[PDB]
């Protein structure tokens, strides 16, 4: 298991524009297109992202290219963020994947606001961090995915992903 395999499980792969868990137009492996309710705005964003007129559909290669960009961007966001970087750097490789997963789903600013969880994770208070992580809109809205990510933070193993 690695971050790509982990996020592929959590996000799925769909080649046609779909709505994510929040109702927002998305494509590929959790590539958010826009928060606009206008499908034409989503299609414009898609065409711009891919560099051709897609008419709402992409190939697997194209989806994987966006995914590479999105993972890369998530990591670089973490490294540029004064609140996230020290916590990320304090973690082992497996827990770093959990961190990337949460930032991928929620965005850098959202995760940077998880002050008490960040502190507990840097302190390596794993069970306490796991309890805190679950006291969240994130957990309540996507509990099966959040449980997997939290188990990864708690244990530093891939047990939740088989």
PDB file of C-alpha atoms in Angstrom:
ATOM      1  CA  UNK A   1       0.000   0.000   0.000  1.00  0.00           C
ATOM      2  CA  UNK A   2       1.000   3.574  -0.806  1.00  0.00           C
ATOM      3  CA  UNK A   3      -0.772   6.951  -0.945  1.00  0.00           C
ATOM      4  CA  UNK A   4      -2.012   6.422  -4.516  1.00  0.00           C
ATOM      5  CA  UNK A   5      -3.532   3.012  -3.743  1.00  0.00           C
ATOM      6  CA  UNK A   6      -5.035   4.389  -0.521  1.00  0.00           C
ATOM      7  CA  UNK A   7      -6.700   7.376  -2.167  1.00  0.00           C
ATOM      8  CA  UNK A   8      -7.815   5.252  -5.134  1.00  0.00           C
ATOM      9  CA  UNK A   9      -9.776   3.104  -2.658  1.00  0.00           C
ATOM     10  CA  UNK A  10     -11.224   6.102  -0.833  1.00  0.00           C
ATOM     11  CA  UNK A  11     -12.103   8.196  -3.903  1.00  0.00           C
ATOM     12  CA  UNK A  12     -12.921   5.579  -6.563  1.00  0.00           C
ATOM     13  CA  UNK A  13     -12.415   6.093 -10.289  1.00  0.00           C
ATOM     14  CA  UNK A  14     -15.158   7.517 -12.499  1.00  0.00           C
ATOM     15  CA  UNK A  15     -14.505   8.726 -16.050  1.00  0.00           C
ATOM     16  CA  UNK A  16     -17.633  10.875 -16.468  1.00  0.00           C
ATOM     17  CA  UNK A  17     -18.462  14.008 -14.472  1.00  0.00           C
ATOM     18  CA  UNK A  18     -20.204  13.022 -11.217  1.00  0.00           C
ATOM     19  CA  UNK A  19     -21.152  14.732  -7.959  1.00  0.00           C
ATOM     20  CA  UNK A  20     -18.970  14.060  -4.909  1.00  0.00           C
ATOM     21  CA  UNK A  21     -20.228  13.372  -1.363  1.00  0.00           C
ATOM     22  CA  UNK A  22     -20.892  17.104  -0.930  1.00  0.00           C
ATOM     23  CA  UNK A  23     -22.820  17.412  -4.217  1.00  0.00           C
ATOM     24  CA  UNK A  24     -19.957  19.073  -6.134  1.00  0.00           C
ATOM     25  CA  UNK A  25     -18.980  18.278  -9.735  1.00  0.00           C
ATOM     26  CA  UNK A  26     -15.947  16.001  -9.776  1.00  0.00           C
ATOM     27  CA  UNK A  27     -14.203  13.583 -12.147  1.00  0.00           C
ATOM     28  CA  UNK A  28     -11.580  10.832 -12.126  1.00  0.00           C
ATOM     29  CA  UNK A  29     -10.096   9.967  -8.726  1.00  0.00           C
ATOM     30  CA  UNK A  30     -11.732  12.690  -6.627  1.00  0.00           C
ATOM     31  CA  UNK A  31     -10.705  15.610  -8.826  1.00  0.00           C
ATOM     32  CA  UNK A  32     -12.978  18.486  -7.793  1.00  0.00           C
ATOM     33  CA  UNK A  33     -13.961  20.570 -10.811  1.00  0.00           C
ATOM     34  CA  UNK A  34     -15.987  23.329  -9.171  1.00  0.00           C
ATOM     35  CA  UNK A  35     -18.414  24.103  -6.367  1.00  0.00           C
ATOM     36  CA  UNK A  36     -20.737  25.763  -8.919  1.00  0.00           C
ATOM     37  CA  UNK A  37     -24.118  24.084  -9.443  1.00  0.00           C
ATOM     38  CA  UNK A  38     -23.767  24.865 -13.177  1.00  0.00           C
ATOM     39  CA  UNK A  39     -22.762  21.742 -15.118  1.00  0.00           C
ATOM     40  CA  UNK A  40     -21.454  23.976 -17.924  1.00  0.00           C
ATOM     41  CA  UNK A  41     -19.040  25.648 -15.484  1.00  0.00           C
ATOM     42  CA  UNK A  42     -17.822  22.164 -14.495  1.00  0.00           C
ATOM     43  CA  UNK A  43     -17.364  21.209 -18.159  1.00  0.00           C
ATOM     44  CA  UNK A  44     -15.371  24.403 -18.770  1.00  0.00           C
ATOM     45  CA  UNK A  45     -13.120  23.593 -15.800  1.00  0.00           C
ATOM     46  CA  UNK A  46     -12.706  20.041 -17.087  1.00  0.00           C
ATOM     47  CA  UNK A  47     -11.673  21.139 -20.578  1.00  0.00           C
ATOM     48  CA  UNK A  48      -9.206  23.622 -19.069  1.00  0.00           C
ATOM     49  CA  UNK A  49      -7.720  20.950 -16.781  1.00  0.00           C
ATOM     50  CA  UNK A  50      -7.289  18.387 -19.579  1.00  0.00           C
ATOM     51  CA  UNK A  51      -6.405  20.758 -22.438  1.00  0.00           C
ATOM     52  CA  UNK A  52      -9.071  19.554 -24.890  1.00  0.00           C
ATOM     53  CA  UNK A  53     -12.850  19.578 -25.354  1.00  0.00           C
ATOM     54  CA  UNK A  54     -13.873  16.563 -23.260  1.00  0.00           C
ATOM     55  CA  UNK A  55     -17.661  16.939 -23.241  1.00  0.00           C
ATOM     56  CA  UNK A  56     -17.716  15.646 -19.664  1.00  0.00           C
ATOM     57  CA  UNK A  57     -15.702  12.464 -20.237  1.00  0.00           C
ATOM     58  CA  UNK A  58     -12.001  11.574 -19.808  1.00  0.00           C
ATOM     59  CA  UNK A  59      -9.745   8.526 -20.206  1.00  0.00           C
ATOM     60  CA  UNK A  60      -8.134   6.503 -17.399  1.00  0.00           C
ATOM     61  CA  UNK A  61      -4.709   7.989 -18.298  1.00  0.00           C
ATOM     62  CA  UNK A  62      -6.172  11.493 -18.027  1.00  0.00           C
ATOM     63  CA  UNK A  63      -7.761  10.681 -14.642  1.00  0.00           C
ATOM     64  CA  UNK A  64      -4.454   9.308 -13.369  1.00  0.00           C
ATOM     65  CA  UNK A  65      -2.646  12.437 -14.594  1.00  0.00           C
ATOM     66  CA  UNK A  66      -5.003  14.688 -12.597  1.00  0.00           C
ATOM     67  CA  UNK A  67      -4.521  12.346  -9.624  1.00  0.00           C
ATOM     68  CA  UNK A  68      -0.725  12.698  -9.839  1.00  0.00           C
ATOM     69  CA  UNK A  69      -1.090  16.478  -9.933  1.00  0.00           C
ATOM     70  CA  UNK A  70      -3.592  16.503  -7.062  1.00  0.00           C
ATOM     71  CA  UNK A  71      -1.471  14.306  -4.776  1.00  0.00           C
ATOM     72  CA  UNK A  72       1.656  16.338  -5.604  1.00  0.00           C
ATOM     73  CA  UNK A  73      -0.222  19.575  -4.890  1.00  0.00           C
ATOM     74  CA  UNK A  74      -1.607  18.180  -1.564  1.00  0.00           C
ATOM     75  CA  UNK A  75       1.919  17.301  -0.371  1.00  0.00           C
ATOM     76  CA  UNK A  76       3.344  20.662  -1.414  1.00  0.00           C
ATOM     77  CA  UNK A  77       0.455  22.444   0.376  1.00  0.00           C
ATOM     78  CA  UNK A  78       1.374  20.584   3.568  1.00  0.00           C
ATOM     79  CA  UNK A  79       5.072  21.473   3.201  1.00  0.00           C
ATOM     80  CA  UNK A  80       4.297  25.193   2.680  1.00  0.00           C
ATOM     81  CA  UNK A  81       1.924  25.408   5.653  1.00  0.00           C
ATOM     82  CA  UNK A  82       3.495  26.543   8.934  1.00  0.00           C
ATOM     83  CA  UNK A  83       0.890  24.645  10.995  1.00  0.00           C
ATOM     84  CA  UNK A  84       0.965  21.404   8.993  1.00  0.00           C
ATOM     85  CA  UNK A  85       4.629  20.951   8.061  1.00  0.00           C
ATOM     86  CA  UNK A  86       6.055  20.271  11.554  1.00  0.00           C
ATOM     87  CA  UNK A  87       3.305  17.745  12.299  1.00  0.00           C
ATOM     88  CA  UNK A  88       3.751  16.026   8.921  1.00  0.00           C
ATOM     89  CA  UNK A  89       7.527  15.893   9.371  1.00  0.00           C
ATOM     90  CA  UNK A  90       7.093  14.410  12.867  1.00  0.00           C
ATOM     91  CA  UNK A  91       5.140  11.447  11.470  1.00  0.00           C
ATOM     92  CA  UNK A  92       6.274   8.064  10.151  1.00  0.00           C
ATOM     93  CA  UNK A  93       5.671   7.139   6.492  1.00  0.00           C
ATOM     94  CA  UNK A  94       2.306   5.404   6.994  1.00  0.00           C
ATOM     95  CA  UNK A  95       0.799   8.155   9.155  1.00  0.00           C
ATOM     96  CA  UNK A  96       2.079  10.708   6.612  1.00  0.00           C
ATOM     97  CA  UNK A  97      -0.192   8.958   4.102  1.00  0.00           C
ATOM     98  CA  UNK A  98      -3.152   9.443   6.432  1.00  0.00           C
ATOM     99  CA  UNK A  99      -2.267  13.145   6.629  1.00  0.00           C
ATOM    100  CA  UNK A 100      -2.118  13.472   2.836  1.00  0.00           C
ATOM    101  CA  UNK A 101      -5.449  11.637   2.556  1.00  0.00           C
ATOM    102  CA  UNK A 102      -7.193  14.078   4.921  1.00  0.00           C
ATOM    103  CA  UNK A 103      -5.713  17.132   3.142  1.00  0.00           C
ATOM    104  CA  UNK A 104      -6.720  15.674  -0.254  1.00  0.00           C
ATOM    105  CA  UNK A 105     -10.340  15.327   0.930  1.00  0.00           C
ATOM    106  CA  UNK A 106     -10.756  18.427   3.102  1.00  0.00           C
ATOM    107  CA  UNK A 107      -8.174  20.868   1.783  1.00  0.00           C
ATOM    108  CA  UNK A 108      -5.118  22.375   3.463  1.00  0.00           C
ATOM    109  CA  UNK A 109      -6.944  25.208   5.272  1.00  0.00           C
ATOM    110  CA  UNK A 110      -9.511  22.801   6.750  1.00  0.00           C
ATOM    111  CA  UNK A 111      -6.894  20.407   8.115  1.00  0.00           C
ATOM    112  CA  UNK A 112      -4.757  23.292   9.449  1.00  0.00           C
ATOM    113  CA  UNK A 113      -7.724  24.160  11.669  1.00  0.00           C
ATOM    114  CA  UNK A 114      -7.679  20.751  13.438  1.00  0.00           C
ATOM    115  CA  UNK A 115      -5.529  22.315  16.204  1.00  0.00           C
ATOM    116  CA  UNK A 116      -6.041  19.785  18.977  1.00  0.00           C
ATOM    117  CA  UNK A 117      -5.665  16.742  16.680  1.00  0.00           C
ATOM    118  CA  UNK A 118      -2.501  18.237  15.168  1.00  0.00           C
ATOM    119  CA  UNK A 119      -0.997  18.673  18.645  1.00  0.00           C
ATOM    120  CA  UNK A 120      -1.913  15.158  19.797  1.00  0.00           C
ATOM    121  CA  UNK A 121      -0.482  13.654  16.608  1.00  0.00           C
ATOM    122  CA  UNK A 122       2.793  15.564  16.997  1.00  0.00           C
ATOM    123  CA  UNK A 123       2.882  14.324  20.624  1.00  0.00           C
ATOM    124  CA  UNK A 124       2.327  10.732  19.363  1.00  0.00           C
ATOM    125  CA  UNK A 125      -0.684  10.380  21.659  1.00  0.00           C
ATOM    126  CA  UNK A 126      -2.283   8.062  19.147  1.00  0.00           C
ATOM    127  CA  UNK A 127      -5.432   6.880  20.913  1.00  0.00           C
ATOM    128  CA  UNK A 128      -6.211  10.402  22.124  1.00  0.00           C
ATOM    129  CA  UNK A 129      -5.639  11.811  18.626  1.00  0.00           C
ATOM    130  CA  UNK A 130      -7.918   9.158  17.144  1.00  0.00           C
ATOM    131  CA  UNK A 131     -10.720  10.060  19.598  1.00  0.00           C
ATOM    132  CA  UNK A 132     -10.322  13.747  18.761  1.00  0.00           C
ATOM    133  CA  UNK A 133     -10.278  13.160  14.982  1.00  0.00           C
ATOM    134  CA  UNK A 134     -13.711  11.501  15.177  1.00  0.00           C
ATOM    135  CA  UNK A 135     -15.318  14.526  16.904  1.00  0.00           C
ATOM    136  CA  UNK A 136     -15.810  16.205  13.562  1.00  0.00           C
ATOM    137  CA  UNK A 137     -18.178  17.003  10.721  1.00  0.00           C
ATOM    138  CA  UNK A 138     -15.660  15.069   8.606  1.00  0.00           C
ATOM    139  CA  UNK A 139     -16.204  11.858  10.531  1.00  0.00           C
ATOM    140  CA  UNK A 140     -19.982  12.256  10.750  1.00  0.00           C
ATOM    141  CA  UNK A 141     -20.411  12.932   7.020  1.00  0.00           C
ATOM    142  CA  UNK A 142     -18.005  10.260   5.742  1.00  0.00           C
ATOM    143  CA  UNK A 143     -17.701   7.795   8.640  1.00  0.00           C
ATOM    144  CA  UNK A 144     -16.528   4.693   6.825  1.00  0.00           C
ATOM    145  CA  UNK A 145     -13.704   6.551   5.089  1.00  0.00           C
ATOM    146  CA  UNK A 146     -12.847   8.583   8.193  1.00  0.00           C
ATOM    147  CA  UNK A 147     -12.675   5.353  10.259  1.00  0.00           C
ATOM    148  CA  UNK A 148     -10.070   3.988   7.813  1.00  0.00           C
ATOM    149  CA  UNK A 149      -8.014   7.178   7.883  1.00  0.00           C
ATOM    150  CA  UNK A 150      -8.266   7.384  11.688  1.00  0.00           C
ATOM    151  CA  UNK A 151      -7.187   3.740  12.115  1.00  0.00           C
ATOM    152  CA  UNK A 152      -4.160   4.599   9.955  1.00  0.00           C
ATOM    153  CA  UNK A 153      -3.345   7.562  12.241  1.00  0.00           C
ATOM    154  CA  UNK A 154      -3.911   5.416  15.342  1.00  0.00           C
ATOM    155  CA  UNK A 155      -1.807   2.403  14.330  1.00  0.00           C
ATOM    156  CA  UNK A 156       0.692   3.488  11.682  1.00  0.00           C
ATOM    157  CA  UNK A 157      -0.311   0.348   9.748  1.00  0.00           C
ATOM    158  CA  UNK A 158      -2.371  -0.315   6.628  1.00  0.00           C
ATOM    159  CA  UNK A 159      -4.769  -2.625   8.513  1.00  0.00           C
ATOM    160  CA  UNK A 160      -7.855  -0.597   7.508  1.00  0.00           C
ATOM    161  CA  UNK A 161      -7.086  -0.959   3.786  1.00  0.00           C
ATOM    162  CA  UNK A 162      -6.329  -4.695   3.997  1.00  0.00           C
TER     163      UNK A 162
END
